[PDB]
Amino acid sequence: SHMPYTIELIQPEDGEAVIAMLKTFFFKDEPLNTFLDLGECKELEKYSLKPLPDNCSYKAVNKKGEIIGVFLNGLMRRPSPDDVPEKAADSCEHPKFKKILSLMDHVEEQFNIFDVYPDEELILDGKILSVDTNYRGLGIAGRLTERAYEYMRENGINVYHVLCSSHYSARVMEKLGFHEVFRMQFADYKPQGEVVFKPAAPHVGIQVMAKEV
Ligand SMILES: CC(=O)SCCNC(=O)CCNC(=O)[C@H](O)C(C)(C)COP(=O)(O)OP(=O)(O)OC[C@H]1O[C@@H](n2cnc3c(N)ncnc32)[C@H](O)[C@@H]1OP(=O)(O)O
Ligand SMILES: OCCc1c[nH]c2ccccc12
Ligand SMILES: OCCc1c[nH]c2ccccc12
Ligand SMILES: OCCc1c[nH]c2ccccc12
Numbered sequence: 206s207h208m209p210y211t212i213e214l215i216q217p218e219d220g221e222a223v224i225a226m227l228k229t230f231f232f233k234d235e236p237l238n239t240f241l242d243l244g245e246c247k248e249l250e251k252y253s254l255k256p257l258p259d260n261c262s263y264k265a266v267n268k269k270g271e272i273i274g275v276f277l278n279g280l281m282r283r284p285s286p287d288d289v290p291e292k293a294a295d296s297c298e299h300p301k302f303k304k305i306l307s308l309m310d311h312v313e314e315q316f317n318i319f320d321v322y323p324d325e326e327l328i329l330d331g332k333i334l335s336v337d338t339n340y341r342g343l344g345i346a347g348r349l350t351e352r353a354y355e356y357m358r359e360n361g362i363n364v365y366h367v368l369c370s371s372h373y374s375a376r377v378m379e380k381l382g383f384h385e386v387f388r389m390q391f392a393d394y395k396p397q398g399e400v401v402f403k404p405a406a407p408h409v410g411i412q413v414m415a416k417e418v
């Protein structure tokens with residue numbers, strides 16, 4: 206049997222298994238990744254492992270011990286009064302991944318989640334969410350998300366922030382009790398005067414989603 210599954214804290218020694226799962230699914234089937242045909246992307250591998258030592262990322266593991274879902278989260282801190290805002294895309298050599306990092310930089314230049322919550326110093330950031338295709342539609346995304354609420358409660362974190370790359374994923378977060386705090390249509394994202402991302406019409410654009418727990 207493959208069911209039931211558990212939800213467990215991701216450990217540093219899980220890095221290779223996490224990357225293997227993401228390469229099978231997220232790298233190929235997150236909408237922007239598939240639109241670009243990301244391919245091999247060691248920089249996304251490194252990006253995905255970065256939040257693990259924050260000790261608040263979760264894996265769904267089936268009855269055979271295989272990872273069938275992950276939600277990789279990191280703590281984000283309010284920029285210091287003397288902050289030097291850096292563009293993440295400036296340190297990326299992979300051209301396709303750079304386009305995604307540039308989109309993230311653009312969102313952050315237009316919208317600062319910390320402006321919404323002036324009293325908060327630390328906010329949980331949901332960075333990478335992926336569920337194995339054969340296990341989709343079972344509520345695993347919600348159970349991964351709910352495990353983060355436990356971490357938030359234990360540590361007095363009030364806000365969970367998730368940048369969603371498609372209305373499809375934003376709708377999942379809405380079902381889980383998140384609400385939109387910022388949006389941008391792909392048709393309106395023209396950093397150098399021209400559209401960069403043209404996925405299918407139902408995706409629409411990015412929505413930053415937030416929940417206060
Ligand atoms: C911060 C970020 O990572 S943003 C990018 C988010 N990740 C991606 O886009 C990667 C590709 N997508 C996925 O991995 C998954 O679709 C996820 C993680 C978004 C959702 O995971 P799931 O555990 O399937 O979520 P859930 O069980 O709530 O199903 C969501 C919706 O998918 C639909 N769905 C239903 N059955 C299936 C199925 N077999 N396969 C795919 N979708 C299904 C339903 O519309 C369902 O909503 P509903 O059950 O409330 O009616
Ligand atoms: O918040 C953005 C989530 C995301 C969508 N596509 C990606 C590719 C690499 C890393 C993160 C993302
Ligand atoms: O191919 C679309 C992949 C997808 C991304 N987010 C979702 C949410 C629900 C169902 C499918 C998706
Ligand atoms: O259902 C689509 C709702 C929507 C309106 N404007 C947007 C911009 C980005 C993502 C989604 C939307």
